[model samples]
Target: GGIRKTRETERLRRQLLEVFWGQDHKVDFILQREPYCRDINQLSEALLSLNF
Candidate 1:
């Protein structure tokens, strides 16, 4: 379960970065899925911070 969770989180993080930052936008900080998932507020903040 731990391995699966880690992989999923990593995939989610990658997808988020690709979808957001891939659009020629700058990211002030690295986005990690675990922290983003752990806190809804953090996730909202990250999404809002996206240049898009």
Candidate 2:
């Protein structure tokens, strides 16, 4: 599942970037698929920083 999760995480990150301008519900959708994701918080911090 390593490659699968990696690609999913990459796709999720791109979605997060889209979330920067797209819908918040998209975040819910993404998180729903990987609630235990370790990088969620890290990506969130980057999102916050990207807003600056």
Candidate 3:
């Protein structure tokens, strides 16, 4: 009954905003609702590998 992850490229982008001065609650909300979601540091690592 929820949406899906297609590219995750956009998800990666928005997550940056959530990590940076965005709604703290929203971050937790997504993390909680999401299953086996990685931590902020992990996400950063993935991004670094992708971007650079």
Candidate 4:
């Protein structure tokens, strides 16, 4: 099984990244499947907010 908001958050984040970058910047993102889930969350947030 998976998390409830997993799909929601993941889809939203993907769309957000695409919208932010458009069809120019070659940027990408993914979830880190490890003990650093919290770190991944923080990193993703920072990337989405352009604070990375």
Candidate 5:
């Protein structure tokens, strides 16, 4: 469970970084599963800081 959660979180972090910084909008990978959080506010602060 711990390892699975870590992998999911890492995936989201990667996606966030890609959307935040990638100019070409390339797809590194597909997100087959939805975002892990039950609430969109889960990463509101982090995303805001990233200027998204």
Candidate 6:
């Protein structure tokens, strides 16, 4: 159980980093564009929806 949760946490961190640094402005892009982006999953979804 703990192992699965740890894996999920790592996976989510990777996804967030992808969204955080996928743009030229680095993490600022997502920070400015998605000020309300509190959830990494939603952020990742939005990033996927965009070409970022």
Q: Pick the candidate with the highest lDDT.
A: 2
Model 2 Cα lDDT, one tens digit per residue, 21-40: 22365443443444545345
Q: lDDT for every model?
A: 0.36, 0.43, 0.39, 0.38, 0.35, 0.41
Ranking by lDDT: 2, 6, 3, 4, 1, 5
Top TM-score prediction, candidate number: 4
Q: Per-candidate RMSD vs. true structure? A: 9.6, 6.2, 6.7, 10.5, 7.7, 10.9
Which runs in model 3 stand beyond 4 Å of their true positions? 1-37
User: Which residue pairs clash in candidate 6?
Assistant: none
lDDT of 1 at 20: 27
Q: Compared with the true structure, what per-residue lDDT tens digits does model 1 show for residues 1-52?
A: 3532323433434554432222232221324333443333224445644534
The all-Cα superposition gives candidate 3 an RMSD in Å to the true structure of 6.7
**Candidate 4 global TM-score:** 0.29
What C-alpha lDDT, on a 0 to 100 scale, does residue 31 get in candidate 4? 38
Please count the clashing residue pairs in each candidate, in the order shown.
0, 0, 0, 0, 0, 0
TM-score of 5: 0.21
Error of 2 at 38 (Å): 8.1
TM-score of each: 0.21, 0.23, 0.23, 0.29, 0.21, 0.21
Question: What ranges in model 5 sit over 4 Å off?
Answer: 1-4, 16-52
Which residue ranges in model 6 land beyond 4 Å of their true spot? 1-37
**Which parts of model 2 have CA positions greater than 4 angstroms off?**
11-28, 32-34, 38-52
